[PDB]
Amino acid sequence: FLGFLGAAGSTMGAASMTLTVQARNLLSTVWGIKQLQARVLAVERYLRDQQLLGIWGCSGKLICCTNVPWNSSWSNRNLSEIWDNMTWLQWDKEISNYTQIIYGLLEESQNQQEKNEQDLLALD
Amino acid sequence: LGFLGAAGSTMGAASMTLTVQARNLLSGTVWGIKQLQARVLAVERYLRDQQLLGIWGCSGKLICCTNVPWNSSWSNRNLSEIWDNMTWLQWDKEISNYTQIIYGLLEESQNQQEKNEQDLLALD
Amino acid sequence: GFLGAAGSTMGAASMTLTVQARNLLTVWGIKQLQARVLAVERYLRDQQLLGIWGCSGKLICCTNVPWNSSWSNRNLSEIWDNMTWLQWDKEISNYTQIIYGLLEESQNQQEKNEQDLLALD
Amino acid sequence: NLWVTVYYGVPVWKDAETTLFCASDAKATHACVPTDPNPQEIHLENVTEEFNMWKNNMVEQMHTDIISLWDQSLKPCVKLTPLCVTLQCTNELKNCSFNMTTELRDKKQKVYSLFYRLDVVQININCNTSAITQACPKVSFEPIPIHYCAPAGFAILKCKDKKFNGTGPCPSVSTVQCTHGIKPVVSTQLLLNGSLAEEEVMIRSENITNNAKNILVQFNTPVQINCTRPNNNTRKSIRIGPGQAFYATSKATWNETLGKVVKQLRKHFGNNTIIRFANSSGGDLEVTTHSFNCGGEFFYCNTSGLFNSTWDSITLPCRIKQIINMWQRIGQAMYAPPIQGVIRCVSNITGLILTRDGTFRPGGGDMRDNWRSELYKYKVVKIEPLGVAPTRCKRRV
Amino acid sequence: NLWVTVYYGVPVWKDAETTLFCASDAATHACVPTDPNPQEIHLENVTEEFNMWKNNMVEQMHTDIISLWDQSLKPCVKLTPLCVTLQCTNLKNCSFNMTTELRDKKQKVYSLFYRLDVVQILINCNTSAITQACPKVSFEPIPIHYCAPAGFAILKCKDKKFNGTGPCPSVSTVQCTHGIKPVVSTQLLLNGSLAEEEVMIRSENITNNAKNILVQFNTPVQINCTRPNNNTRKSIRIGPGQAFYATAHCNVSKATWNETLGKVVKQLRKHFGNNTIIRFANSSGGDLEVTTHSFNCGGEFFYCNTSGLFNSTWISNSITLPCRIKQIINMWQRIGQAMYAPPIQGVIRCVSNITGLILTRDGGTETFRPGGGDMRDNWRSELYKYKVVKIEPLGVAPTRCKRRV
Amino acid sequence: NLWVTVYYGVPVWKDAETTLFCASDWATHACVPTDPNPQEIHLENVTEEFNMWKNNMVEQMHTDIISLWDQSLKPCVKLTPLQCTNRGELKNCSFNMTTELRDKKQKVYSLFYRLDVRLINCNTSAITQACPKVSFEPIPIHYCAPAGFAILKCKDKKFNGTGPCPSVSTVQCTHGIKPVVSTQLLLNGSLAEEEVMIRSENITNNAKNILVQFNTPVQINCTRPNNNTRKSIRIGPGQAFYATVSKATWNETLGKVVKQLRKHFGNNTIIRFANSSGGDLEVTTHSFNCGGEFFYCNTSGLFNSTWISNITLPCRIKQIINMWQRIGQAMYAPPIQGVIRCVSNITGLILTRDGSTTETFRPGGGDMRDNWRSELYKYKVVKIEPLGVAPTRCKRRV
Numbered sequence A: 001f002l003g004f005l006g007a008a009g010s011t012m013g014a015a016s017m018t019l020t021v022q023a024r025n026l027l028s029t030v031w032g033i034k035q036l037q038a039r040v041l042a043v044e045r046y047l048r049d050q051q052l053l054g055i056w057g058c059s060g061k062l063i064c065c066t067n068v069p070w071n072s073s074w075s076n077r078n079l080s081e082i083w084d085n086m087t088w089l090q091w092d093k094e095i096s097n098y099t100q101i102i103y104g105l106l107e108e109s110q111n112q113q114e115k116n117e118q119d120l121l122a123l124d
Numbered sequence B: 001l002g003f004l005g006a007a008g009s010t011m012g013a014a015s016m017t018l019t020v021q022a023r024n025l026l027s028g029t030v031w032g033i034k035q036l037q038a039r040v041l042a043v044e045r046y047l048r049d050q051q052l053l054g055i056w057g058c059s060g061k062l063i064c065c066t067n068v069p070w071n072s073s074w075s076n077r078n079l080s081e082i083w084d085n086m087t088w089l090q091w092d093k094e095i096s097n098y099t100q101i102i103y104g105l106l107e108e109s110q111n112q113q114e115k116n117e118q119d120l121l122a123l124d
Numbered sequence C: 001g002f003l004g005a006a007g008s009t010m011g012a013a014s015m016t017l018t019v020q021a022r023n024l025l026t027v028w029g030i031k032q033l034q035a036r037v038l039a040v041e042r043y044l045r046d047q048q049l050l051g052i053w054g055c056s057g058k059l060i061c062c063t064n065v066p067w068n069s070s071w072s073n074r075n076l077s078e079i080w081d082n083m084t085w086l087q088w089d090k091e092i093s094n095y096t097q098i099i100y101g102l103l104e105e106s107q108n109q110q111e112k113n114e115q116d117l118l119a120l121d
Numbered sequence D: 001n002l003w004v005t006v007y008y009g010v011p012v013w014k015d016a017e018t019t020l021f022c023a024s025d026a027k028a029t030h031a032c033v034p035t036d037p038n039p040q041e042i043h044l045e046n047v048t049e050e051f052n053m054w055k056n057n058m059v060e061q062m063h064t065d066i067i068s069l070w071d072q073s074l075k076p077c078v079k080l081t082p083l084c085v086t087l088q089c090t091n092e093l094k095n096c097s098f099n100m101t102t103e104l105r106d107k108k109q110k111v112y113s114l115f116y117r118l119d120v121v122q123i124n125i126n127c128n129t130s131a132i133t134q135a136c137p138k139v140s141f142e143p144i145p146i147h148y149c150a151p152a153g154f155a156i157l158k159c160k161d162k163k164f165n166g167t168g169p170c171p172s173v174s175t176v177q178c179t180h181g182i183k184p185v186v187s188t189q190l191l192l193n194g195s196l197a198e199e200e201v202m203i204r205s206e207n208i209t210n211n212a213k214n215i216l217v218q219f220n221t222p223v224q225i226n227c228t229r230p231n232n233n234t235r236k237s238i239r240i241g242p243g244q245a246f247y248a249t250s251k252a253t254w255n256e257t258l259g260k261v262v263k264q265l266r267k268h269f270g271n272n273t274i275i276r277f278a279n280s281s282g283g284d285l286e287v288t289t290h291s292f293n294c295g296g297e298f299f300y301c302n303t304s305g306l307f308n309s310t311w312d313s314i315t316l317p318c319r320i321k322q323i324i325n326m327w328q329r330i331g332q333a334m335y336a337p338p339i340q341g342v343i344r345c346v347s348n349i350t351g352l353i354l355t356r357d358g359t360f361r362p363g364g365g366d367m368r369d370n371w372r373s374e375l376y377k378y379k380v381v382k383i384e385p386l387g388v389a390p391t392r393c394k395r396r397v
Numbered sequence E: 001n002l003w004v005t006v007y008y009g010v011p012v013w014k015d016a017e018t019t020l021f022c023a024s025d026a027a028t029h030a031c032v033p034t035d036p037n038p039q040e041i042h043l044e045n046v047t048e049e050f051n052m053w054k055n056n057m058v059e060q061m062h063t064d065i066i067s068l069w070d071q072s073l074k075p076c077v078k079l080t081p082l083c084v085t086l087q088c089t090n091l092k093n094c095s096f097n098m099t100t101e102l103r104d105k106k107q108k109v110y111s112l113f114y115r116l117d118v119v120q121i122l123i124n125c126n127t128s129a130i131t132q133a134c135p136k137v138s139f140e141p142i143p144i145h146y147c148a149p150a151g152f153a154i155l156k157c158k159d160k161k162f163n164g165t166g167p168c169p170s171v172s173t174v175q176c177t178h179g180i181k182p183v184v185s186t187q188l189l190l191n192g193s194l195a196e197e198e199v200m201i202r203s204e205n206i207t208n209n210a211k212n213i214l215v216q217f218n219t220p221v222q223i224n225c226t227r228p229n230n231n232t233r234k235s236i237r238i239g240p241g242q243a244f245y246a247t248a249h250c251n252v253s254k255a256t257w258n259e260t261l262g263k264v265v266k267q268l269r270k271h272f273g274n275n276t277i278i279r280f281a282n283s284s285g286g287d288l289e290v291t292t293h294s295f296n297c298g299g300e301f302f303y304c305n306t307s308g309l310f311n312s313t314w315i316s317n318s319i320t321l322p323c324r325i326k327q328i329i330n331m332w333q334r335i336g337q338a339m340y341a342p343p344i345q346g347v348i349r350c351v352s353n354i355t356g357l358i359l360t361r362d363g364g365t366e367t368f369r370p371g372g373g374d375m376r377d378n379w380r381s382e383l384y385k386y387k388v389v390k391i392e393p394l395g396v397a398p399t400r401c402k403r404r405v
Numbered sequence F: 001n002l003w004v005t006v007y008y009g010v011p012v013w014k015d016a017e018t019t020l021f022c023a024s025d026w027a028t029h030a031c032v033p034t035d036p037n038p039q040e041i042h043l044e045n046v047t048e049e050f051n052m053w054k055n056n057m058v059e060q061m062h063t064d065i066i067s068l069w070d071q072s073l074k075p076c077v078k079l080t081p082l083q084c085t086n087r088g089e090l091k092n093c094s095f096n097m098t099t100e101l102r103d104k105k106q107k108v109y110s111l112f113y114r115l116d117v118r119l120i121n122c123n124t125s126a127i128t129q130a131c132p133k134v135s136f137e138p139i140p141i142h143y144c145a146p147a148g149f150a151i152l153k154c155k156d157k158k159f160n161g162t163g164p165c166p167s168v169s170t171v172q173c174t175h176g177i178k179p180v181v182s183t184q185l186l187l188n189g190s191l192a193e194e195e196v197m198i199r200s201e202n203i204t205n206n207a208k209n210i211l212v213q214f215n216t217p218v219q220i221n222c223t224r225p226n227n228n229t230r231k232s233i234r235i236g237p238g239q240a241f242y243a244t245v246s247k248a249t250w251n252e253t254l255g256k257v258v259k260q261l262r263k264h265f266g267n268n269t270i271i272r273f274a275n276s277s278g279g280d281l282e283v284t285t286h287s288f289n290c291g292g293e294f295f296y297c298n299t300s301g302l303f304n305s306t307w308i309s310n311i312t313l314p315c316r317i318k319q320i321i322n323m324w325q326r327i328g329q330a331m332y333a334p335p336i337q338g339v340i341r342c343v344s345n346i347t348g349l350i351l352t353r354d355g356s357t358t359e360t361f362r363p364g365g366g367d368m369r370d371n372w373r374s375e376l377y378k379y380k381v382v383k384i385e386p387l388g389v390a391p392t393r394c395k396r397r398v
């Protein structure tokens, strides 16, 4: 119970132990009209992230395994260099260039190609 | 080929580009209140569609297999005829009489009997 | 119909679950907007729990959290065949947030990380 | 060995108060959703829910709604500020003469009109209390049935009982999304066009024991009431410009009803002793009179001809007070522009508002009770569809 | 052995009307900035049928402009103390008494109004109350993009020449309609969309004379307007705080107009016959907002005769039309509301492109007079290519796959 | 052999500005009440850089106050229908006033101050009296961030508002921040722990104001000691016009300020304190509301000093105000029956500077946004970015 954003200064490997704490607190007459569009933005801010999580073969929360091979050009770092000597804030900075490449590769990467073959496979 | 790109193509070919209309299905003081109701309407029309996918055994996006048998009385046709010689706009009009029959059949014939089945089945 | 088995037994009530879930979703009119804005954050708040719990798509879902006897140690027949949900929610009411907290972490956290380990093989 | 299992959609509710929305029959009625051509009502077998019609939030949201929606009916209408002037009057009606502002600032205008005795007072009535705005002549004041409903995630339970005083356990309960379309009728002392009780008449009070607490009566047999404004009037629209313009000038059923009322009323008072009926003890003009709007015209009668008793039709004395400050709202006063031609009004009486001595008097005062003559059936609950319960089910990893 | 399958994101839409929002390039403060490059997706092998006459987008834009403009008069000074008897002489030099900053005193002041703003005993008091415009705000036109929210889309008829009705073979869809000019011009279209190939003629009913006839140019016609007098405005103090601001031919080329008209008469073509005479005539009469080419230029209202343009006869085989300022106006025929335009320091000169015409005709050779009346027609000269659709992404269809049990 | 994997809830946030809602334990009513025990989460090994000068919260708080205050004069009585003799701070002015009826008039005996007077309002703007039912009593306000966002708090005892913060925490809601409208002197603000600190957008530039935060609070009493009376003259219809510091503790504080000034101007230089040179009356004076009547008190008795290296103030009243330089809008304060007494804490100063070894310091004024900055220096809004992709050598089961 390290709290919301608790493991921010911790390594990536340790910060993935406390994932369910930043995810549950992700949705948490004039004048009052200024609190309404904050509520409204809060859900479109949340459905946008989960549509991706849906277009990607995940939906299932917190962690998700993929069939996208990580080409070296994205990082070229031993997982020990990443999980045990780096924070998520640092990592998001390194890959910032290739992130939207990965996002596009994910959806096409399996589900477009993965859900379709299950359709073929689930025929027999 | 972009949003609504395969509207004029055959059903078989239009299902390859499902993720382009699905990703652009949520699309990321008075007078400004007119733009607020719009994006409030945006989520409730999206959630109304996805509530069905929820009570159906889908959840996973774009394509989903089911166990509801396709009844002959509803659009009895050659598979090649349906997917290689028909557009979705044409198809949505022909099954139009039997759609909400299928919608209701889906929620009960498939998930309601399927998860209680698993509930009984996962006993040992 | 909606809320049909409210007076029925828990066992008979879980048959008709899909009826309460399908129906679960300029001034003056501003009062109707907050109603339908609350409606979705009222719905997603329930679906977030179903998400961090490993269910999400399921109306009934099974888990591997053992039912600790401290919570309503009663024979299974009593709970399903001799109680209504309104009576049950009152007895569990002390332990419900314990269950809720145990559901998210006690398995899914060690259960997702397990498959993450198992999927590396 | 047992394991928890999450169930979604379990029938579990708790009492709750929230914002409710509006419905407008078959179609402030501008954005109200049309009602389902057939609403749906679901009975709750083996269910007992307890009601407290006197501690119900629905009335206090309906009452806070009518007062505020009504004010909107006065915002695009002509303000009357230039009509607080010395009146030179002569002889219930009065032919008052007065100087009036024109379209131009400098020029003036002499005009005569026709006002009632209640709307005027001797100069040593509204100016004394508040400013005033005339109503828009384009809007209609016909009462229309209104359905109060609960949004998604909530529900309303209704007591499916023929005889119910509004409190205690309800054995036959149903739930609906929408209250039956309801008439927000503005009546004094006497209820008009309300919900008629099934089978025998009953009486309702927050506290019987406190005579200060009003005593609501709901008829079973309806009482027709005919009233009329029988003089063919004409109105001249004097130009208080620019643009703005001011528009200047059976007891056979009552005894059978009371006879049924005495018996039910006597049961609480006891079988041995007798009750007395008397006229209003006093207060504002709104309690003393059976004041309601009719044909677009506001209308008042002393009901002393009905309430004299110890246990062919009897007319009631009937006057008109053109200006009103309803709901004890000061600062806001409305002038009712009269209508061309003679008005005939026909409605039935459906209940009574009665007060008690330290004998029965016609009630008045707070309008919440009027809504409670309809909202006794209803209470709002919140839905809690998440359930965890043990079963023999296991999830595989 | 066939089974159903749910498909999500299927390309299916239906005609529908909903609330649309605004975008304003890079009342226009609440409009979200337009994407620096929008995206347009052609719909191959798609034929959609349009009915510009039954467009909802037009009647939403029009109701928008009306309710938008009323907001432009709320924080502005109300003129109520300006309904006073006017002592006038010949433009007219009128004198009048005035309320001062304090309640007691009065003030004599003289101003300068137009013959149309006044009547012998101002015209508005007879009709409605009045509010002057805020001098801080401006009425210059900015391109406005109407956009459809998520779950909806807007279809565009790509084809170079379109009547506004019937089947469109080349269709596309975008989130936002192009930069549409919200300009209220009367008789002649100003700064509008110029047709790609040949000028289009469009009317709700061609055979019916009573339905106004819209024309769309392909060659723009230049036009110069000017208020050539250096005015000075003096702010008399109708306090407290509030202050009233007390106090013209327009030109188009003829060499292009003869060239333009000849394309127009040939554009009529079959509709009235190849073998027929075509008549042009001045306005038959009506409201001052119909009889003249009314438009706002540089914050003042210029009400010009088109009588010089419209008299011609056409057999099968630098002219200038002047103007008088209109002063107060109740645009959109809205009564109870009235705006007085506060005059501006300096001389005004503005030049806009003419892009089309609004014309009415008489029933029986046929004659044509300048059109006017409702401003909805002005919007339909831009929204002819557009219509709104809902997106219905759920699809069920037979397949041969089965899920687990 | 490594593969992408999707993580949700990863602790990643970016600087951002957005609309914030309100939290309140009459303007405060309708503002969503506070949680009985908030949660504050420390961010270990985290160093976040703050820039109090480029904070959007202040300017969202400032724009909120201005636009919520005008709503406090909307349902109130308009004073558009509005001979004097006495020096005398007040003047007994008579005037003819309209009654309920347009024709009849009424003579009146009223008492206005020299500063409010024709009244000064007409030359500039229209005027509206405040509703006498609503109150201007300061009550703590919490500013909160909606879902998907968070607020970072610098848990440093001594912080000038810029640079890196080695101990950062996050909260959904700021602390109970006092919206106290005071000038020159900050009243009931946040008290700095231990040593007092000094903050200016640019230290080198004299024109930039210089905000001082006390650690030892300064008790201050002001009192309107005359028992006034209210006769509600009938300016109908319906509407009605309502007609009529320790020197022992201050030097201890100042003596800490010269040590607080420290090396910023040099140890050797002398520090002189002088009154404001002039400007608008809201700058020249420690203007604040107390008990509903607006106080203007001369602070020349506190700022007269020359500090080498090694207490009552006058007060006057204005019946009407145009706060925030807002013209077109003017509020008349209906006076209160009885004597007025207040006891507040002076919590900080706002100071300006002059253009050898001579340093002159004046009381502060200008934008009221600076005083909000005396509370919002510890805060900044961040946007939560919970989606992450990384390699973990797991592959999806097929």
Ligand SMILES: *[C@@H]1O[C@H](CO)[C@@H](O[C@@H]2O[C@H](CO)[C@@H](O[C@@H]3O[C@H](CO[C@H]4O[C@H](CO)[C@@H](O)[C@H](O)[C@@H]4O)[C@@H](O)[C@H](O[C@H]4O[C@H](CO)[C@@H](O)[C@H](O)[C@@H]4O[C@H]4O[C@H](CO)[C@@H](O)[C@H](O)[C@@H]4O)[C@@H]3O)[C@H](O)[C@H]2NC(C)=O)[C@H](O)[C@H]1NC(C)=O
Binding pocket: F202, F203, F204, F205, F206
């Ligand atoms: C907080 O407030 C302080 C003031 O209290 C303020 O500090 C001032 O900052 C400005 C710049 O931001 C400084 O102005 C610059 O000063 C340099 C150096 O000036 C000294 O040396 C020259 C030459 O000996 C003397 O004349 C002068 O009196 C000083 O002794 C100047 O060189 C700068 O001018 C150059 O750049 C300009 C660019 O626009 C040119 O227009 C100009 O012609 C000059 O160009 C020449 O020099 C360049 C190198 O500087 C060279 O690259 C060119 O090719 C060309 O040869 C400029 O005037 C000022 O001195 C500071 N004053 C103090 C007291 O500190 C802070 O900026 C403020 N903080 C913030 C955040 O705003």
Ligand SMILES: *[C@@H]1O[C@H](CO)[C@@H](O[C@@H]2O[C@H](CO)[C@@H](O[C@@H]3O[C@H](CO[C@H]4O[C@H](CO)[C@@H](O)[C@H](O)[C@@H]4O)[C@@H](O)[C@H](O[C@H]4O[C@H](CO)[C@@H](O)[C@H](O)[C@@H]4O)[C@@H]3O)[C@H](O)[C@H]2NC(C)=O)[C@H](O)[C@H]1NC(C)=O
Binding pocket: D207, D208, D209, D210, D211
């Ligand atoms: C609905 O309306 C009715 C009235 O119409 C209200 O009923 C009254 O309720 C109050 C209390 O809520 C009752 O007052 C209490 O009565 C007790 C018993 O009184 C009887 O016995 C004594 C002794 O023999 C006699 O003197 C008396 O005349 C009665 O015969 C008293 O014991 C109480 O006083 C005690 O408690 C107080 C506490 O403050 C002490 O100060 C006293 O010294 C003493 O110890 C008390 O007076 C009253 O009798 C009720 N009247 C009726 C007619 O029922 C209901 O309250 C109201 N409903 C609601 C919700 O308010």
Ligand SMILES: *[C@@H]1O[C@H](CO)[C@@H](O[C@@H]2O[C@H](CO)[C@@H](O[C@@H]3O[C@H](CO)[C@@H](O)[C@H](O)[C@@H]3O)[C@H](O)[C@H]2NC(C)=O)[C@H](O)[C@H]1NC(C)=O
Binding pocket: D142, D143, D185, D192, D193, D292, D293, D294, D295, D346, D347, D348
């Ligand atoms: C009590 O309810 C009755 C309905 O049973 C109300 O009587 C109804 O009154 C309305 C208007 O007050 C009548 O509508 C009018 O009809 C005339 C004639 O067609 C038309 O010219 C008007 O434009 C308007 O539509 C309606 O006919 C009438 N119904 C009956 C059955 O008489 C009565 O007003 C209610 N009483 C109160 C106090 O609200």
Ligand SMILES: *[C@@H]1O[C@H](CO)[C@@H](O[C@@H]2O[C@H](CO)[C@@H](O[C@@H]3O[C@H](CO)[C@@H](O)[C@H](O)[C@@H]3O)[C@H](O)[C@H]2NC(C)=O)[C@H](O)[C@H]1NC(C)=O
Binding pocket: E140, E141, E183, E190, E191, E295, E296, E297, E298, E349, E350, E351, E352, E353
């Ligand atoms: C149709 O489009 C023409 C453009 O060709 C518009 O003319 C332009 O009008 C704007 C304002 O209406 C002018 O901008 C102003 O310029 C003056 C002088 O430079 C300046 O003082 C103002 O601050 C503002 O910038 C612009 O110069 C002018 N351009 C031309 C070429 O005339 C015309 O207004 C449009 N017609 C209608 C009816 O909207």
Ligand SMILES: *[C@@H]1O[C@H](CO)[C@@H](O[C@@H]2O[C@H](CO)[C@@H](O)[C@H](O)[C@H]2NC(C)=O)[C@H](O)[C@H]1NC(C)=O
Binding pocket: B078, B079, B080, B081
């Ligand atoms: C789909 O339709 C085609 C016709 O378009 C069917 O083809 C016919 O098949 C029969 C025998 O199965 C032949 O005798 C005909 O000559 C064929 N006609 C053509 C035009 O090909 C085909 O059978 C249908 N597919 C299925 C699976 O039934």
Ligand SMILES: *[C@@H]1O[C@H](CO)[C@@H](O[C@@H]2O[C@H](CO)[C@@H](O)[C@H](O)[C@H]2NC(C)=O)[C@H](O)[C@H]1NC(C)=O
Binding pocket: F219, F220, F221, F245, F246, F343
């Ligand atoms: C402001 O007034 C308060 C009283 O309201 C003064 O506080 C008193 O201080 C004396 C000694 O200075 C104590 O004996 C009293 O017990 C205090 N009373 C209260 C209620 O605090 C305070 O000293 C005054 N401030 C100044 C600067 O004189």
Ligand SMILES: *[C@@H]1O[C@H](CO)[C@@H](O[C@@H]2O[C@H](CO)[C@@H](O)[C@H](O)[C@H]2NC(C)=O)[C@H](O)[C@H]1NC(C)=O
Binding pocket: F137, F138, F180, F182, F187, F188, F288, F289, F290, F291, F342, F343, F344, F345
């Ligand atoms: C600063 O806070 C003090 C309390 O420490 C406030 O003093 C209170 O003022 C109210 C009315 O303004 C009185 O009802 C209380 O009795 C006072 N309490 C004390 C202890 O003096 C003071 O008003 C605040 N200052 C400002 C400017 O809001």
Ligand SMILES: *[C@@H]1O[C@H](CO)[C@@H](O)[C@H](O)[C@H]1NC(C)=O
Binding pocket: A071, A072, A073, A074, A098, A101
């Ligand atoms: C990823 O690696 C592939 C080779 O497998 C290469 O084509 C591509 O350029 C790399 N990604 C980027 C962003 O360059």
Ligand SMILES: *[C@@H]1O[C@H](CO)[C@@H](O)[C@H](O)[C@H]1NC(C)=O
Binding pocket: B071, B072, B073, B074, B098
């Ligand atoms: C096939 O569908 C029809 C409805 O179109 C339904 O009545 C019938 O029962 C279905 N077939 C069978 C075998 O049930």
Ligand SMILES: *[C@@H]1O[C@H](CO)[C@@H](O)[C@H](O)[C@H]1NC(C)=O
Binding pocket: D224, D225, D226, D250, D313, D346
């Ligand atoms: C009351 O009015 C009805 C018509 O609405 C009429 O038939 C009846 O005779 C009237 N009765 C009395 C007693 O006025």
Ligand SMILES: *[C@@H]1O[C@H](CO)[C@@H](O)[C@H](O)[C@H]1NC(C)=O
Binding pocket: D196, D222, D347, D348
């Ligand atoms: C009450 O009056 C209505 C007409 O408004 C009439 O139709 C109805 O029958 C009356 N009530 C009863 C119980 O008959």
Ligand SMILES: *[C@@H]1O[C@H](CO)[C@@H](O)[C@H](O)[C@H]1NC(C)=O
Binding pocket: E222, E223, E224, E351
């Ligand atoms: C009229 O305007 C045009 C631009 O459209 C300009 O070139 C021309 O100079 C103007 N007329 C005269 C006489 O200058």
